[PDB]
Structure formats: structure tokens, C-alpha cells
Design a protein around this ligand. Structure first.
Ligand SMILES: *Cc1c(COP(=O)(O)O)cnc(C)c1O
Ligand SMILES: *Cc1c(COP(=O)(O)O)cnc(C)c1O
Lengths: 396, 396
């Protein structure tokens, strides 16, 4: 039965982790997978999280299955982070949120839901994009088309090309937007670009799907939600797949959400019943730990305060490694000007290195970056900066 | 886009918990969903688990993503529970285990793997079965066909009827078996029946899929794995979807596993890689908490000891309640003779009440059982036994 199964190709991101592991080379540097490291180079558990955990340890009395859609407080809290304290979306009971296993499972849930209940035939993702997007949608039997987005030459957002390629997006097609901190580019539309995009989609008939994995790493919690919030203001229907992996460092606990928005409560209710059905036929009910952690922190002023600061610290430290990266580069040779690297948001910079250049960094110098040239700034530290900037220079 | 979405029908099981939750009635009794309750009527966290949790609280230093296939040691431990500590499958490096989100997630994972990497078209499941089985398979585009299984008049396993049913199954068809504690009947094949089935499927060319959610609830850990293990000795390939929701009371942490066995390692590897791919396109990686809990317990002799005792305790308490259930019914003037209930294993009993009797039991007495007549024995207690038993009598 399995005789003729062809090995599949390794995840272009997950893959490298393997390789990374397997490499005995003493001074290896991992800038591939998007994980936030700290000055010491470790991937720590937030203090607000350890606190929330002790709290559960002490207060949990049952491991009783959660509801298909998970922890109600969790969805409530998610809806507020997303749309804001007093959104009409909330007051009008227009949004329903399902706790899912990471932003990843949220995407899948959304896909399955779409494929099976709407006549959505294609999904438009950006080029470049996050590698896993294709696989998720494809697995649900949806077509993935790509829309232009980055200007290699100028290291920026090519609005025209953006707009010019979406012209072929039919009405009823799904258009996927990254809420903030575009992965892998780090280039986001300005509030105005967003407002335009939002006008366009309504006019053109697209269903927006927000992939929101880095809320809080660009500017701030509220600030990072402006584009969505702008869309939510003109849209009747929307989907939001969001993750808490990064902003809470709860990577392995698989904490995410899938929010469905509809013109009205009755509609969002009916529709969400089908989303629930799709989850049932999948993993049934979601993992409690992670999300409990999240709900505890977000609904306790103190822990929340602690949490907001850790996030700020996280965001700030990445910003600092950013400027230090451009400086060290310069100060170390570098033919190219890497200044554009400072105007990018999030954990990564699309460095502009070639595929052969990255192969070489790895092979020769032991630095791991993704073949697209995407580096994880959060993985840079004062201590590895030099040796890392040296390897880059030697490959220029 | 959602204007026309049809509300989905309710989950015969899941949706019954809602109904339950919503009724203001004082002495309601929940005999629906399969949860273990204790003498006091609560659904507790095992102490072995609480112990393991503290341990993690204190020793976890990162929440770093797990491998797509999860915690390695967790997989190790799973294989030994399943096959033997000792087994050839293990020595021969012929089995690969992916940690998944519940036994449910493992089923979906298997379905997706099959549907896309093999020529499987149909999946055979017992009649009756666990309702969710059809939805999961149908979602992956697989056809679900049923094979006879229960002798309603006699309260037993109708073997020839089973065998004459599967005879209709083609080579290369998947045949789904419940490892032990058949849900919803509680009737499992004798070791000789298992052996027969095993020889028969090897000859007929069926790919066996074991759904193993109740290890340790029938007779014991090791003995409950006998049918599987007999299949494992004759088969080149098989799949095992196991859950730890029940034997560890880790219901909401979503702990399960999907085990793949192939003629050999070269083959199980290639194949597993396609399984990993199917996971990547799903939730990406599995939830750490629950699984770490399980791996900690199974790894430590002390903790494991404690855990096995708790499990024998749970199993024993259910055995007791069953005896008590028949006696009380008898002592309350039941028409029918319910002794067959003693010969069934696991959490449930297929009581033989009709649709209308179970409907009546609920509206009228507030006793909740599944429309199939399935009652959750683990939900009975000495304190509710009387009232429960009186409601039944009143409806017969
Ligand atoms: C990390 C990531 C996700 C999903 O992450 P989870 O780990 O599943 O929460 C989705 N989209 C992007 C762009 C990501 O970077
Ligand atoms: C409980 C159960 C499952 C899956 O349970 P999870 O909570 O998803 O681990 C699968 N099959 C049967 C027969 C079950 O009883």
C-alpha cells in the first residue's frame, strides 16, 4: 500500500531546523525559523506566561473537553485585541471566534470552511509570501494565485503592481493579507494604502482573509490592527486567522484563532455553525493550556501589564538589533547599502542575498537563513553580530 | 458570501452537552459524552498529571516549536504501549509515530494521508460506530461503508454477519477497527476472533486502521493491545490512531498519536514524510503540554506507577458501577433483564432503549443519554444511581 509513496520535499523552513540540529559545527548561527531569541541567545518563556501557568496548576480542577470553538473568554479577548475595545463589530454581535491550534490551524479551518461552503475557488496570496500558505489552501482544494507586492530594486512595496495584479482577481475570490509585519518582506502598507485596498476590495467583490501572526511587533498592539480595523469598517464579511505564538512566545502550545465576520448576527451564527462542523471533522476541540494561558493573562490587569512590557521589550530589542545589523555591516566592509533594513517591521528582513549566497553562508560559514534571503533579526545578538556580519560580507 | 450558508446539523454527541449545560433543572444527570466521573460526580485531574505539570512548570525553559511529529520520547513511549517494549516493529524500526491533537486529529491526519498518497477510496466502519468517524473520513474525500457488527437481539458480536459483510470489501480498502472498548457497544472480539480477522484481512488485502482511544479500560494496558498486536504480527502495514484523552483524563489538552507501520524502515520513512506533509498543511506542529505530561509520566517509574494505579482505579470503578446499575434496575422493577451490560467493556453500555425512550428520559427526567441508547456508565454514581434507575424503569 505504501510501496510507491514518494518522499515529500522538506519544509523549506521547518527543514533547515533539522539541518541546523544535525550540524555539529561549534559556532553555528540560526537566522531561519521565526523565533524570538534574547541577548543571551535563548528562546525563553515569558514571565507573564510562567505566572499564568502556576495559576492554572493551582486552580485547574478538570481537563474536561472544551467546546468546538474553545474558551469563550479567549474569543472575547481576541475579538477586542483585533477590532478594539468598543467595536461595533462586537456590540452588533457580528463576529464569532474559534480557538484553533496556532494561526496555522486557523488558516486550515478557514480553508476547509471556505472550500466546503462557499463557492470560493481561488485564493490570492502575495509574492513573495509565507511558504506554508500554498500548502494550506491547496490541501483544501483551493487554487492559489499570486499578487505582486515587493519591489526588489527599491526594497519596497510596489503599490501599483499590487493593484495592477489584483485586477484579475474576480469577485468572490479570496484575497489574503498579512495584518502587519509582512512575512518575509517586513513591508506593510501605510494606513492609507490599507484604506485604499479596503475600498477596492469592496468595490471589486473580494473576501478578505487576514493572516495576523505578529500583532504587537511593528508598532504596537492597537497600531498594528489599523489595517484590519480599516477593512472591518467597510466590510460586511471577513476572516481573520491570528496567532499568539510569537507575541506570547507560546510557539509549541498552538494558540491561535479564526474569526468569522458577517453582515449580521444571524448570518454569522449560521455560518459559524459550518465552521464548527469543519473543526469537528478535523481535530474536534482545541488544546486548552496555551489558550488558558492567554485568556488568563489578557483578562487580568496585572499579568496583562507584565505581558505588555515583555512584548514591548521584545519589539524593542528587535529594533535595536536592526540598526546594529546595518551598522555592523557597514563598519565591516559591505559593498551594498543595507539601510533599507531599518524600514522593515517584525522579526525578519528580506536581506537581498542570493540563493547561492545563502547556501554558501550555511555551507561555509555556518549561518542559517532561508533560501529567499530572509533573515530573522530576532535571532541576532550583540555576541553573534560580528561573526555574522563577517560571513555576510565574505559572500557579497 | 455567507448569506446562503446553511446552519449545520448538531453533533449527536457534542451538541448534547450544550443542551445539558442549558438546562436549569436541578437534578439533571449526564450520561452522554464519554467522560470519567468520580464518586463525587466530578471530572478530576489525575494526580500523576498534576505532578507532571508541576514538574514542567519548574523545568520548562522554552516554548520552542516542536517537530511536526512532536516529542520524540512521546512517540517512543507510544509505540511500546501499543506494541510491546520488545516488539519487532520497534526493533526493526518499522513504525513511525506523529503526535497529534487527540485521537481525532490522528484520524484526520491518517485520512488526509491516505486520500492523497494512496489509492484508498473507501473506508469500512462498524455498524454502529462512533459518529464522528464518518465525518472525518468524508472530509478527506473518502467513502464510508459499514460492516455489520452488533447482534441487537442477543447483545453480542455477530461474527459471521461481520465477516459476511466485509467479504464485500475490496483489496486495498481500509478496514477500521476499535482497539478495545468498542464504542458504542462495549463488545469486543475475543482474541481468537481477532486472530481470525487478522488472517482474513491479510488474505483479503485490506489496510487496517486501529482506533485506540481506551487502552487500559477493558482488562488492562497490555491485554487491551492484544488484537492490535495480533494484527501487527501478520501485517506489513497498518495505521494506529490512539488517544490519551481518556486513560489520562487529558481531554482538553488534545493528546493523541498516529502510528504508521510499513514493511520496512526505508518504506515507513518515505511514507511518514508524506504524513508529515499532511500535518504541515494542517496545524503544523502539535501542542506540547498534554503530550509532555504523558511522556513525563510514562518515562518516570514513580509517576508511571501512580498513573497506572489511577487508571486501574478508574477501570475498577466503572466495573463496579456496572454491577450496581443492573442490580438497582432489577431492584427497581425493571421489565427487561439487563445483565448483558455486565459483559460489555469500557465507559459505555448500549442499553437498548429506543429513540423515544431516550427522548423521554431527558425531557421528562433530565437524564441525558445518546439517541442510540448509549449510556455512559462512568457517569453513574451511588448517589445518582437510584434516581437514574427510576427514570429508566419509568420509561420501559
Ligand atoms: C508563524 C506564522 C503563522 C502561523 O503560526 P502558528 O505557529 O501556526 O501560530 C501564520 N502566518 C505567518 C505569516 C506566520 O509567520
Ligand atoms: C474518544 C474517541 C476518539 C477521539 O478522542 P480524542 O479526544 O480526540 O482523543 C476516537 N474514537 C473513539 C471511538 C473515541 O471514543
Amino acid at each position: 500500500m505504501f510501496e510507491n509513496i514518494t518522499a515529500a520535499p522538506a519544509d523549506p523552513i521547518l527543514g533547515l531546523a533539522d539541518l541546523f540540529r544535525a550540524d555539529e559545527r561549534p559556532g553555528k548561527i540560526n537566522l531561519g525559523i521565526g523565533l524570538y531569541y534574547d541577548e543571551t541567545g535563548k528562546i525563553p518563556v515569558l514571565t507573564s506566561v510562567k505566572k499564568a501557568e502556576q495559576y492554572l496548576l493551582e486552580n485547574e480542577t478538570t481537563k474536561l473537553y472544551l467546546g468546538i470553538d474553545g474558551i469563550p473568554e479567549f474569543g472575547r479577548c481576541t475579538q477586542e485585541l483585533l477590532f478594539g475595545k468598543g467595536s461595533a463589530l462586537i456590540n452588533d454581535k457580528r463576529a464569532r471566534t474559534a480557538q484553533t491550534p496556532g494561526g496555522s490551524g486557523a488558516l486550515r479551518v478557514a480553508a476547509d470552511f471556505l472550500a466546503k461552503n462557499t463557492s470560493v475557488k481561488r485564493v490570492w496570496v502575495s509574492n513573495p509570501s509565507w511558504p506554508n500558505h500554498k500548502s494550506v489552501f491547496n490541501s483544501a482544494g483551493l487554487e492559489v494565485r499570486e499578487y505582486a507586492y515587493y519591489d526588489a530594486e527599491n526594497h519596497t512595496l510596489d503599490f501599483d503592481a499590487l493593484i495592477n495584479s489584483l485586477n484579475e482577481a474576480q469577485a468572490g475570490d479570496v484575497v489574503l493579507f498579512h495584518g502587519c509585519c509582512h512575512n518575509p518582506t517586513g513591508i506593510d502598507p501605510t494606513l492609507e494604502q490599507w484604506q485604499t485596498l479596503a475600498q477596492l476590495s469592496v468595490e471589486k467583490g473580494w473576501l478578505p482573509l487576514f493572516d495576523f501572526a505578529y500583532q504587537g511587533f511593528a508598532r504596537g498592539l492597537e497600531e498594528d490592527a489599523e489595517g484590519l480595523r480599516a477593512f472591518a469598517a467597510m466590510h460586511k464579511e471577513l476572516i481573520v486567522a491570528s496567532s499568539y505564538s510569537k507575541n506570547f512566545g507560546l510557539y509549541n502550545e498552538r494558540v491561535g484563532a479564526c474569526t468569522l465576520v458577517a453582515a449580521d448576527s444571524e448570518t454569522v451564527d449560521r455560518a459559524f455553525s459550518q465552521m464548527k462542523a469543519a473543526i469537528r471533522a478535523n481535530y474536534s476541540s482545541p488544546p486548552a493550556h496555551g489558550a488558558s494561558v492567554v485568556a488568563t493573562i489578557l483578562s487580568n490587569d496585572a499579568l496583562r501589564a507584565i505581558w505588555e512590557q515583555e512584548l514591548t521589550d521584545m519589539r524593542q530589542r528587535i529594533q535595536r538589533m536592526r540598526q546594529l545589523f546595518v551598522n555592523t555591516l557597514q563598519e565591516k566592509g559591505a559593498n551594498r547599502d543595507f539601510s533599507f533594513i531599518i524600514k522593515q517591521n517584525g522579526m525578519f528582513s528580506f536581506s537581498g542575498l542570493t540563493k547561492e549566497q545563502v547556501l554558501r553562508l550555511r555551507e561555509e560559514f555556518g549561518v542559517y537563513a532561508v533560501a529567499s534571503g530572509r533573515v530573522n533579526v530576532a535571532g541576532m545578538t550583540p555576541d553573534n553580530m560580528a561573526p555574522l556580519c563577517e560571513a555576510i560580507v565574505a559572500v557579497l
